[PDB]
Ligand binder design. Structure first.
Ligand SMILES: [Cl-]
Ligand SMILES: [Cl-]
Ligand SMILES: [Cl-]
Ligand SMILES: [Cl-]
Lengths: 241, 203
């Protein structure tokens, strides 16, 4: 197991940061990758062993250290917008087959101003009687709007249990103001059940958006609530025909 | 040509179809590795092929290593929503004992098989908490595409992808919304986007 922290991170341009990576196994070789659309997995830096470090293919703006075998941290001295990426720590397996084991990724967004960061607003729209009549099925629509950056996880909860059946979610958020550099995002999802299930007023439906926001270490000076990591939900109850 | 060429880059298939994806090089590899990656996760190693010409099976997945060790295929029988993800091939190419090169992957989307498409646009009732009117385009065939757009007041989503763990009520949909008064579902979902025989029931 490779352990990466943090999982999600927001920083302003120019503020130094460190992403940690440690492995429980005793491996000599560890490396850092960034994954960007159309550019695959690009090697930033690699460490063949304790106190041995070598620049990868795209080292500019990164530093590493390997004081200990267990840890291989990635240091961004002066984060720039272009370092907005998904980061993966890898260690090389020592078996006959030398595959890599990867951490679970760090989604880093580098922003001009923390004031650009907004949690989602979340609305649920109830099933159409027209759909119920035509199909004997009932579709709920969840709309998450106004969030930045695009760090969200949308889930559906029926009677207090997360569901997966009947769930279909937009594969990526859309920009609400795509003519503007700092556009906030919207994301939709559908949950479909039988008309019978929807018609039972004991049934409770909740769409949950997990937003990954500012941390305690981030300074906040805006009037509006600090956009910290939080859940925003919208709910509906079954409606009797 | 890259060291490792994966084809196709993007694949959209329907539940129950079979599929084969390819990993090709002009270089001979001692071994090739396959990884699967899901959103919010790191790549996970599936199998390594080492012997020229060999087959390895991992459940519904079959991996072949070419006889010349320049190629590998990944075959899936009866695709399921759980198969959706990024399939990477990797090897020690270009003067590396320690550095893996990763192909660009095949990004596999498993869409529902809709035997009887019944394309329809439903006008939803307003939410007390939003100024938006919302329109649901649903029950269309998985070969029908909807691409995201913003055209003045009118937003349209890309068509959704099944929850990987969905085991029922697997159907296609896109939504449109606007905050303009008098918004018409027919404005968003016009003949450039939807099937000509799409049903528009009145509320
Ligand atoms: Cl479920
Ligand atoms: Cl705009
Ligand atoms: Cl095939
Ligand atoms: Cl369905």
């Amino acid at each position: 197991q490779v352990t990466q922290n943090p999982r999600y991170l927001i920083t302003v341009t120019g503020k130094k940061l460190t992403v940690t990576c440690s492995q429980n196994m005793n491996h000599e070789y560890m490396s850092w990758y960034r994954q960007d659309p159309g550019l695959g997995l690009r090697q930033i830096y690699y460490s063949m062993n304790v106190e041995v470090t070598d620049k990868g293919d795209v080292p500019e703006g990164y530093k590493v250290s390997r004081k200990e075998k267990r840890n291989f941290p990635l240091i961004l001295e002066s984060p720039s917008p272009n370092q907005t990426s998904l980061y993966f720590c890898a260690s090389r397996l020592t078996g006959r087959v030398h595959g890599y084991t990867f951490g679970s990724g760090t989604r880093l967004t580098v922003v001009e101003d923390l004031k650009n960061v907004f949690p989602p607003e979340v609305a649920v729209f109830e099933p159409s009687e027209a759909e119920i009549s035509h199909t004997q099925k009932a579709t709920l629509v969840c709309l998450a709007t106004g969030f930045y950056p695009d760090h969200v996880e949308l889930s559906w909860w029926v009677n207090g249990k997360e569901v997966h059946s009947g769930v279909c979610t937009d594969p990526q958020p859309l920009k609400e103001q795509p003519a503007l550099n700092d556009s906030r995002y919207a994301l939709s999802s559908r949950l479909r059940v039988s008309a019978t299930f929807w018609q039972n007023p004991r049934n409770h439906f909740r769409c949950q958006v997990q937003f990954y926001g500012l941390s305690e270490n981030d300074e906040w000076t805006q009037d509006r609530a600090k956009p910290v990591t939080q859940i925003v939900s919208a709910e509906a109850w079954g409606r009797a025909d | 040509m890259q060291l490792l060429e994966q084809s196709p880059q993007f694949l959209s298939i329907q539940e129950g179809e079979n599929l084969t994806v390819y990993c090709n090089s002009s270089s001979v590899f001692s071994s090739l590795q396959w990884y699967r990656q899901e959103p919010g996760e790191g790549p996970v190693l599936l199998v390594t092929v080492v012997t020229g010409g060999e087959v390895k099976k991992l459940k519904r997945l079959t991996f072949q290593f070419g006889d010349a060790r320049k190629d590998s295929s990944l075959h899936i029988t009866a695709a399921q929503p759980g198969d959706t993800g990024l399939y990477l091939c990797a090897g020690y190419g270009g003067g590396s004992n320690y550095k893996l090169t990763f192909g660009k992957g095949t990004l596999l989307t498993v869409n529902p098989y809709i035997q009887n498409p019944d394309p329809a646009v439903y006008q939803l009732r307003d939410s007390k908490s939003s100024d938006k009117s919302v329109c649901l385009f649903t029950d269309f065939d998985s070969q029908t595409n909807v691409s995201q757009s913003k055209d003045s007041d009118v937003y349209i989503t890309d068509k959704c992808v099944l929850d990987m763990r969905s085991m029922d009520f697997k159907s296609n949909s896109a939504v449109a919304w606007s905050n303009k008064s008098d918004f018409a579902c027919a404005n968003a979902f016009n003949n450039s986007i939807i099937p000509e025989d799409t049903f528009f029931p009145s509320p």
